[PDB]
Amino acid sequence: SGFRKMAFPSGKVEGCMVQVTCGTTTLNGLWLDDVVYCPRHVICTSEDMLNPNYEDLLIRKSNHNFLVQAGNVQLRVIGHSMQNCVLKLKVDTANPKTPKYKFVRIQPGQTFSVLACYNGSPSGVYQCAMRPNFTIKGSFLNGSCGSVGFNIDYDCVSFCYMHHMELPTGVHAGTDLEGNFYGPFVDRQTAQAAGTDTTITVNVLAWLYAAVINGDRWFLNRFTTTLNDFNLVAMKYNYEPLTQDHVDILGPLSAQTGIAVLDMCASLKELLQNGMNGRTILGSALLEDEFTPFDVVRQCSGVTFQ
Amino acid sequence: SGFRKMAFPSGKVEGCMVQVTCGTTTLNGLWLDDVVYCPRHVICTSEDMLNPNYEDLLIRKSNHNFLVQAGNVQLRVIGHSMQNCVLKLKVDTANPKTPKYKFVRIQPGQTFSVLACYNGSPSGVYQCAMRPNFTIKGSFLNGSCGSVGFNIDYDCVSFCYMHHMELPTGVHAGTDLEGNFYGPFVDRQTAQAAGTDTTITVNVLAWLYAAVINGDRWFLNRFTTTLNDFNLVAMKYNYEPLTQDHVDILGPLSAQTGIAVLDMCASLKELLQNGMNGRTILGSALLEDEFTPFDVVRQCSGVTFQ
Numbered sequence: 001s002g003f004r005k006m007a008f009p010s011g012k013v014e015g016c017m018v019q020v021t022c023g024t025t026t027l028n029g030l031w032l033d034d035v036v037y038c039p040r041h042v043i044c045t046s047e048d049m050l051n052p053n054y055e056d057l058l059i060r061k062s063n064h065n066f067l068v069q070a071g072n073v074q075l076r077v078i079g080h081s082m083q084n085c086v087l088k089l090k091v092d093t094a095n096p097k098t099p100k101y102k103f104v105r106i107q108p109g110q111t112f113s114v115l116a117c118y119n120g121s122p123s124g125v126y127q128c129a130m131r132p133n134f135t136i137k138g139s140f141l142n143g144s145c146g147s148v149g150f151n152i153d154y155d156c157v158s159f160c161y162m163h164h165m166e167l168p169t170g171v172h173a174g175t176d177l178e179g180n181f182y183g184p185f186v187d188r189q190t191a192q193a194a195g196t197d198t199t200i201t202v203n204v205l206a207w208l209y210a211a212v213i214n215g216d217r218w219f220l221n222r223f224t225t226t227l228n229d230f231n232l233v234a235m236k237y238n239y240e241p242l243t244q245d246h247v248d249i250l251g252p253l254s255a256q257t258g259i260a261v262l263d264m265c266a267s268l269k270e271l272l273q274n275g276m277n278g279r280t281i282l283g284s285a286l287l288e289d290e291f292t293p294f295d296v297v298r299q300c301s302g303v304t305f306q
Numbered sequence: 307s308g309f310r311k312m313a314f315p316s317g318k319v320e321g322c323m324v325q326v327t328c329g330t331t332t333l334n335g336l337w338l339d340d341v342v343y344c345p346r347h348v349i350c351t352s353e354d355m356l357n358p359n360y361e362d363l364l365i366r367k368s369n370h371n372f373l374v375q376a377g378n379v380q381l382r383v384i385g386h387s388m389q390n391c392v393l394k395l396k397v398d399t400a401n402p403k404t405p406k407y408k409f410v411r412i413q414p415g416q417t418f419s420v421l422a423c424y425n426g427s428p429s430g431v432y433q434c435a436m437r438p439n440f441t442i443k444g445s446f447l448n449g450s451c452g453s454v455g456f457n458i459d460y461d462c463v464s465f466c467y468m469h470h471m472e473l474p475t476g477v478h479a480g481t482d483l484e485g486n487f488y489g490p491f492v493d494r495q496t497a498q499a500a501g502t503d504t505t506i507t508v509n510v511l512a513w514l515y516a517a518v519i520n521g522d523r524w525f526l527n528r529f530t531t532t533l534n535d536f537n538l539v540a541m542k543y544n545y546e547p548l549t550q551d552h553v554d555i556l557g558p559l560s561a562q563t564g565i566a567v568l569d570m571c572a573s574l575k576e577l578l579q580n581g582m583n584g585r586t587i588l589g590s591a592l593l594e595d596e597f598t599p600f601d602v603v604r605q606c607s608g609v610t611f612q
């Protein structure tokens with residue numbers, strides 16, 4: 001019945017997006033209860049961004065210098081502080097649309113939805129993964145800083161990403177909602193290069209399970225393998241090593257399809273060695289690695305949210 | 307700065323989804339002002355679906371047989387009628403969350419977002435195209451019927467699709483919001499096969515323009531072509547014929563990049579003849595055809611919505 005790259009419904013997050021302006025710089029903020037969270041580089045000029053001293057730049061800013069606008073209506077800033085690379089602006093009004101929420105710091109390989117915004121207004125929603133090199137491959141133009149990534153479990157939004165930086169290579173870097181960057185990146189306009197973008201092996205396997213459930217099975221073979229034997233081939237192809245924890249997480253997909261995890265590893269190994277020979281799997285000519293095992297279960301089951 | 311398959315923010319549509327139950331069948335409805343729109347096959351049993359006489363089945367249904375539930379709260383049905391393949395259930399309460407909206411019947415090649423729902427509750431959002439054979443390639447399980455497709459232009463939601471049927475081949479068929487199917491499909495469980503799924507040429511070209519804007523340009527060559535010469539190769543590869551209307555629509559992308567439309571056609575022609583040779587374009591090993599020229603402009607510019 002079909003399998004699609006699918007984002008969470010975005011309404012709960014749309015009701016949290018505001019515009020934040022400091023000086024000549026405008027980007028997005030996240031309004032939850034009576035706090036607005038945004039990237040601290042809102043206080044920088046494009047001059048400042050080469051070597052900013054954020055503590056010093058903040059000395060010159062008062063509450064009234066942070067212009068916060070929710071739709072057409074202005075919010076009153078009654079306090080501000082810096083936590084790592086985010087500012088927290090206390091406003092005098094609790095966001096009436098605040099959903100149940102959590103702040104979560106995700107691990108490489110985990111997926112989330114991004115609500116890309118400009119000037120506090122939603123532009124679109126798409127699905128991303130935290131890459132093993134701690135970048136994400138997004139769609140972000142100037143003014144999109146402060147857009148957030150999130151997951152939803154029924155009624156509760158877990159915010160995991162806030163967007164801050166584009167690297168010279170066109171990939172993206174950002175923080176969790178406590179303001180700590182994922183990976184080694186900093187909020188300065190300098191030479192920072194991403195490391196190897198390896199493939200998230202457990203996600204590829206989950207997606208192969210999804211393909212089998214949906215009728216694409218030409219890649220199933222007569223072979224099996226072992227974790228160590230498969231991992232020799234994964235390393236050669238810049239795939240993440242597969243662990244027993246990963247095998248365990250694939251357990252429910254293995255059980256429903258009747259295909260042992262290591263048998264699916266042997267299918268993956270032949271795909272890596274032989275290529276696709278011009279065929280497709282679930283409409284892709286590449287092996288997709290931005291579906292987690294939990295994503296596959298969810299979509300193949302029809303789980304929903306408030 | 308990156309280019310992603312991107313859906314519209316879904317909040318405005320989330321506030322319109324309800325659950326509709328008739329007998330033992332539950333699916334989704336769309337609540338706009340004081341009318342709930344849903345597939346007429348809600349009145350069928352799985353028996354009925356082999357050869358339904360919808361007019362006859364409706365004789366046995368009264369207002370009180372249609373159970374409409376918005377979140378936890380029941381809506382009072384004060385009238386019902388059948389329009390083509392949709393039912394319209396008049397309720398006694400206008401949806402307080404009704405956005406500005408229109409009903410639009412789209413053309414093959416046009417794209418839209420789908421809010422997949424189960425039991426009136428949103429599950430996820432993804433982007434789709436109306437295929438040239440009038441199917442869509444979605445992600446729909448039992449109970450997702452009545453999920454809708456839509457586009458947004460600033461504050462106004464244009465609803466273009468309601469989901470009704472999965473064909474035996476795993477592709478999807480549905481109606482506009484006046485209840486007329488796209489293509490030749492009917493709401494009966496019978497032998498209906500899709501025609502040729504051809505590639506939407508103008509969308510592929512738009513996506514190649516997007517790639518150039520974002521740094522992927524290895525596929526640009528030293529050649530040009532003509533509409534007629536390109537169309538001979540398109541036919542061979544089951545690509546839609548390119549028209550002068552299509553060339554005109556690509557005009558703004560041509561102007562911004564400085565690459566004449568027919569020059570990009572010559573790049574596409576070499577890609578079709580030679581394949582990708584194992585390379586990728588914007589993270590795909592296939593030529594993507596579910597971005598319209600307007601989608602590319604929008605995403606490459608940062609246009610937003612209420």
Ligand SMILES: O=C1Nc2ccccc2C2(CCN(CCc3ccc(C(F)(F)F)cc3)CC2)O1
Nearest residue numbers: 001252253256296297298300301446447448449
């Ligand atoms: O729409 C429909 N009609 C339908 C019609 C005929 C056969 C099967 C179906 C199903 C019914 C639920 N069936 C869920 C089975 C399942 C799959 C994966 C997992 C898991 F591994 F992810 F956990 C668990 C259960 C999916 C297909 O759906």
Ligand SMILES: O=C1Nc2ccccc2C2(CCN(CCc3ccc(C(F)(F)F)cc3)CC2)O1
Nearest residue numbers: 140141142143307558559562602603604606607
């Ligand atoms: O974020 C940023 N910083 C930035 C930094 C350096 C160079 C360019 C930029 C741009 C500035 C706007 N620029 C829009 C140009 C444009 C592209 C396509 C079209 C169209 F063909 F679709 F119509 C029209 C205009 C995109 C990149 O963006």
